[PDB]
Amino acid sequence: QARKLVEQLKMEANIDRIKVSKAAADLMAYCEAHAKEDPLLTPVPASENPFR
Amino acid sequence: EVWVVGMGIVMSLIVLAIVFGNVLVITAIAKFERLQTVTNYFITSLACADLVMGLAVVPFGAAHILTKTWTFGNFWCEFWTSIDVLCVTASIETLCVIAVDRYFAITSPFKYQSLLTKNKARVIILMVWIVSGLTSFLPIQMHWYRATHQEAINCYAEETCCDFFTNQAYAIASSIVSFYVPLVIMVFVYSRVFQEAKRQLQKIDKSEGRHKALKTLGIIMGTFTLCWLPFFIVNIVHVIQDNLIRKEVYILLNWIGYVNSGFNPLIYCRSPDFRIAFQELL
Amino acid sequence: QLRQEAEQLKNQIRDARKACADATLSQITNNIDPVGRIQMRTRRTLRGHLAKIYAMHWGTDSRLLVSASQDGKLIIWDSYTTNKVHAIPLRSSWVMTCAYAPSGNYVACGGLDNICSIYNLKTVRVSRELAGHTGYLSCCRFLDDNQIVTSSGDTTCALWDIETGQQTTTFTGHTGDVMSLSLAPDTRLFVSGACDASAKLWDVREGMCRQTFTGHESDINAICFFPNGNAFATGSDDATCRLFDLRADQELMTYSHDNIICGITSVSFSKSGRLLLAGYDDFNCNVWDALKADRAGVLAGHDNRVSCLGVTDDGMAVATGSWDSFLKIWN
Amino acid sequence: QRNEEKAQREANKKIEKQLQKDKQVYRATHRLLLLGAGESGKSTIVKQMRGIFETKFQVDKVNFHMFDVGGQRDERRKWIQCFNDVTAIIFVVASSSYNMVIRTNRLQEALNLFKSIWNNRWLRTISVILFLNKQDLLAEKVLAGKSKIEDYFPEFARYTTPEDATPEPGEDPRVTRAKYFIRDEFLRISTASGDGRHYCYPHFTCAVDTENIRRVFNDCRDIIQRMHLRQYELL
Numbered sequence: 001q002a003r004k005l006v007e008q009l010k011m012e013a014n015i016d017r018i019k020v021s022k023a024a025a026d027l028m029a030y031c032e033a034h035a036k037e038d039p040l041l042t043p044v045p046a047s048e049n050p051f052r
Numbered sequence: 053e054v055w056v057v058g059m060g061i062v063m064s065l066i067v068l069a070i071v072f073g074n075v076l077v078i079t080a081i082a083k084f085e086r087l088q089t090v091t092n093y094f095i096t097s098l099a100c101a102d103l104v105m106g107l108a109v110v111p112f113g114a115a116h117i118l119t120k121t122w123t124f125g126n127f128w129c130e131f132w133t134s135i136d137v138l139c140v141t142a143s144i145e146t147l148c149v150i151a152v153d154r155y156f157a158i159t160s161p162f163k164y165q166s167l168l169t170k171n172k173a174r175v176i177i178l179m180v181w182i183v184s185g186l187t188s189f190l191p192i193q194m195h196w197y198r199a200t201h202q203e204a205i206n207c208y209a210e211e212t213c214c215d216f217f218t219n220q221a222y223a224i225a226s227s228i229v230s231f232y233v234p235l236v237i238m239v240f241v242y243s244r245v246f247q248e249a250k251r252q253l254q255k256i257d258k259s260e261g262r263h264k265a266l267k268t269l270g271i272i273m274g275t276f277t278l279c280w281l282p283f284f285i286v287n288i289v290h291v292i293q294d295n296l297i298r299k300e301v302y303i304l305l306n307w308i309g310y311v312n313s314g315f316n317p318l319i320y321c322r323s324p325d326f327r328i329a330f331q332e333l334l
Numbered sequence: 335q336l337r338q339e340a341e342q343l344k345n346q347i348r349d350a351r352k353a354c355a356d357a358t359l360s361q362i363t364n365n366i367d368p369v370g371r372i373q374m375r376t377r378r379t380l381r382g383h384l385a386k387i388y389a390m391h392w393g394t395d396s397r398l399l400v401s402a403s404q405d406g407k408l409i410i411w412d413s414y415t416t417n418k419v420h421a422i423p424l425r426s427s428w429v430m431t432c433a434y435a436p437s438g439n440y441v442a443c444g445g446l447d448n449i450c451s452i453y454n455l456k457t458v459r460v461s462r463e464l465a466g467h468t469g470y471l472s473c474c475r476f477l478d479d480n481q482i483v484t485s486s487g488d489t490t491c492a493l494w495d496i497e498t499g500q501q502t503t504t505f506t507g508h509t510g511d512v513m514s515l516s517l518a519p520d521t522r523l524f525v526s527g528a529c530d531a532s533a534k535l536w537d538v539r540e541g542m543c544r545q546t547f548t549g550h551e552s553d554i555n556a557i558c559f560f561p562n563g564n565a566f567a568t569g570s571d572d573a574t575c576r577l578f579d580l581r582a583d584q585e586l587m588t589y590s591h592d593n594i595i596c597g598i599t600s601v602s603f604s605k606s607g608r609l610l611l612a613g614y615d616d617f618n619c620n621v622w623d624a625l626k627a628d629r630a631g632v633l634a635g636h637d638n639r640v641s642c643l644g645v646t647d648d649g650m651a652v653a654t655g656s657w658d659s660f661l662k663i664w665n
Numbered sequence: 666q667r668n669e670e671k672a673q674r675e676a677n678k679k680i681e682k683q684l685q686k687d688k689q690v691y692r693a694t695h696r697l698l699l700l701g702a703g704e705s706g707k708s709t710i711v712k713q714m715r716g717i718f719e720t721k722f723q724v725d726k727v728n729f730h731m732f733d734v735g736g737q738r739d740e741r742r743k744w745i746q747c748f749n750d751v752t753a754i755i756f757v758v759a760s761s762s763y764n765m766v767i768r769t770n771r772l773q774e775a776l777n778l779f780k781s782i783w784n785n786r787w788l789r790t791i792s793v794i795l796f797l798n799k800q801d802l803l804a805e806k807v808l809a810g811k812s813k814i815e816d817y818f819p820e821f822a823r824y825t826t827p828e829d830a831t832p833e834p835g836e837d838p839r840v841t842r843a844k845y846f847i848r849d850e851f852l853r854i855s856t857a858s859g860d861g862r863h864y865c866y867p868h869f870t871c872a873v874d875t876e877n878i879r880r881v882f883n884d885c886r887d888i889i890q891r892m893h894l895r896q897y898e899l900l
């Protein structure tokens with residue numbers, strides 16, 4: 001019971017964490033680089049749209 | 053004439069109100085998928101009938117009253133009369149059908165789902181419209197309703213006056229089919245519904261020891277009765293006894309029956325869903 | 335006793351997470367241009383379910399999607415042509431999840447009945463019936479044609495081998511029932527959000543919860559990875575949607591508006607990851623901007639409560655299946 | 666080419682016809698949920714009318730379908746929000762479990778469960794049919810002086826039997842007071858929260874009773890009648 005929880009927290013303790021600035025910058029870079037190929041973000045042309 | 057312009061203004065307001073209300077009803081039903089319901093198909097049928105009435109017979113009738121003459125052709129006089137009869141009969145029969153639907157929904161809740169379907173509702177609406185159209189167009193278009201006395205003959209031959217003269221037989225038949233049979237059916241339906249509501253309220257009081265039906269039924273029945281019954285009574289009388297009733301009173305009661313159409317959608321569309329749909333529309 | 339040690343380790347984890355933080359995503363993001371207003375309309379409105387809808391899953395292609403309802407029929411639709419390719423009657427009257435295999439050959443459904451039935455589209459019959467769960471299976475997803483991961487009413491999440499029909503491994507460590515699950519672009523990692531505020535990342539091969547995120551104040555109804563796979567977003571009965579980052583191991587942002595108090599049933603991301611789309615108990619969907627956290631659009635077409643929300647792999651369209659038995663395709 | 670489109674349209678038409686038949690079958694059937702305490706006596710009443718237990722019993726040519734989600738010892742009920750189209754929720758409570766306290770009384774926990782069901786944001790239009798099991802055993806307990814409700818329930822000390830209460834053809838005043846006190850304890854929770862959309866129907870049932878099917882049929886009929894009346898603003 002409690003031993004399993006203690007072991008799980010001990011295992012979760014030793015995890016390397018990168019600074020939030022770097023992670024935010026990586027998410028920013030992905031969103032900026034892959035923004036061109038997004039029909040939702042940029043209104044797709046009517047001819048290009050399969051639905052309409 | 054100040055008297056004439058006032059009548060023109062009041063009829064213009066009446067036709068505008070009828071058209072606006074009914075168009076709003078059809079638009080609200082058609083726009084939203086939540087509103088489309090088996091009973092709402094009958095509501096749409098009633099709204100369409102009243103809208104056709106307001107578009108066709110109210111403006112032409114007002115023009116006939118104000119100008120005191122019929123500028124258009126005799127065939128258009130007959131067509132206008134047929135359209136008016138069709139609209140009135142369809143509207144009243146649709147009210148009767150709505151009452152019957154409520155009766156079958158309350159009295160037999162278990163079998164109500166199977167009793168009424170979309171296809172069956174469409175069949176019922178088509179049958180109502182077919183019988184109304186027959187009763188209106190066929191006797192009028194085939195000239196069975198035309199009277200025999202010289203007073204009607206001169207009016208029918210003349211191309212300037214569009215007045216209604218009818219036999220003692222067609223008047224009775226049309227009045228019966230349009231109003232009296234629907235009146236009896238609706239009275240019996242709403243008596244049964246009131247008894248069921250009273251029984252349910254009595255049971256609820258028997259339990260949970262720690263009115264509303266009367267007001268709603270009073271609206272639904274009394275408005276329709278006070279709007280249509282006098283006109284049909286004088287419709288029967290004018291062939292039963294010609295001398296008593298006057299033409300002006302006859303037309304006045306007919307116009308009360310007309311404004312019944314504009315009163316209908318304020319009564320039959322007070323549900324909160326219809327209110328939300330109306331708010332979204334406007 | 336052991337509770338003191340557990341509290342000490344939890345405090346150490348909290349201190350490490352706090353020291354790891356440098357600045358919020360808003361601090362970096364506020365400089366860039368906003369997404370602007372986003373307008374979407376119901377390109378296709380798909381009809382044919384008797385009862386209210388809970389779950390849909392887009393196929394590998396953007397063409398096909400599968401939906402289920404309590405009327406007992408699992409219907410596969412062709413989104414482009416608005417045609418019903420298949421309709422599968424379901425043994426269980428109540429179903430709460432759907433799954434469309436990456437190959438498209440198989441489709442699996444769960445339900446209140448504690449059985450994960452898998453149907454072979456290309457033969458529709460019950461290929462395998464998966465049993466061994468105490469509680470209702472809330473969500474099911476496909477690692478491949480042979481492997482399926484199911485979150486169930488009991489705290490355990492399980493990985494199954496379809497051919498063998500037995501649980502290859504079971505994931506334990508949650509307090510409440512597991513409601514939502516999402517797979518990474520690579521099939522190695524997956525998370526599961528449960529009734530408890532905690533949402534845990536799992537490792538399929540190891541079978542252990544590497545990280546646990548507990549930012550929420552209530553049950554988590556929806557969870558979904560970022561397309562990169564480094565982040566995921568969680569819905570809740572609270573009006574907040576939160577974006578969690580695996581490397582940072584803590585919450586990055588919360589998506590909430592003062593006016594809305596309804597919970598979030600389903601969440602999803604756009605292909606680029608800029609737009610977070612979240613369903614709501616308020617009969618409408620909201621399209622947040624992930625970086626800005628400022629709402630960019632609203633989808634109020636549905637009449638009843640939305641229950642599912644998926645975005646095509648191509649990124650062409652978004653489909654929301656609500657409780658009015660009506661599933662609508664937005665673009 | 667167009668042949669594939671024509672074949673797909675034909676398949677769509679066949680599926681639509683099958684769905685229409687399924688809708689015709691589905692509309693007739695009325696769905697019920699039988700929620701109750703584990704020790705209340707659900708099994709006996711289920712056998713009386715007859716992970717999830719589904720039974721199909723028909724009365725007066727009306728198809729009733731009943732589901733009973735038992736087991737797993739669930740305390741936070743999330744499946745309860747799925748049962749939104751059910752006409753009625755059958756609640757089975759043992760009114761004779763007042764003295765038996767499972768570490769709070771079982772009847773008190775049943776009252777809490779009924780309150781949770783009643784005050785649910787999703788079951789705001791679902792009526793509850795309440796069955797109070799083991800009236801004979803309740804009578805056996807109340808006739809004996811070992812356990813009295815006043816000791817366990819403090820409101821019973823000042824409580825009195827309702828004037829309009831209808832006693833059984835053969836029943837003691839004390840058991841009548843006890844059963845009516847329990848029924849009013851449930852009905853006090855039932856009445857306050859509701860706005861008139863849904864009601865509670867309390868029925869006093871023994872294990873030997875076999876007329877429960879008719880009682881459920883009548884309760885469902887009343888529920889649908891009241892729903893239709895309120896829809897038309899008549900009630």
Ligand SMILES: CN[C@@H]1CCc2c(ccc(O)c2O)[C@H]1O
Pocket residue numbers: 133136137140141216223226227230306
């Ligand atoms: C222009 N006057 C018409 C002619 C007779 C008639 C009317 C309405 C309903 C009927 O059933 C009728 O037979 C009147 O509106």
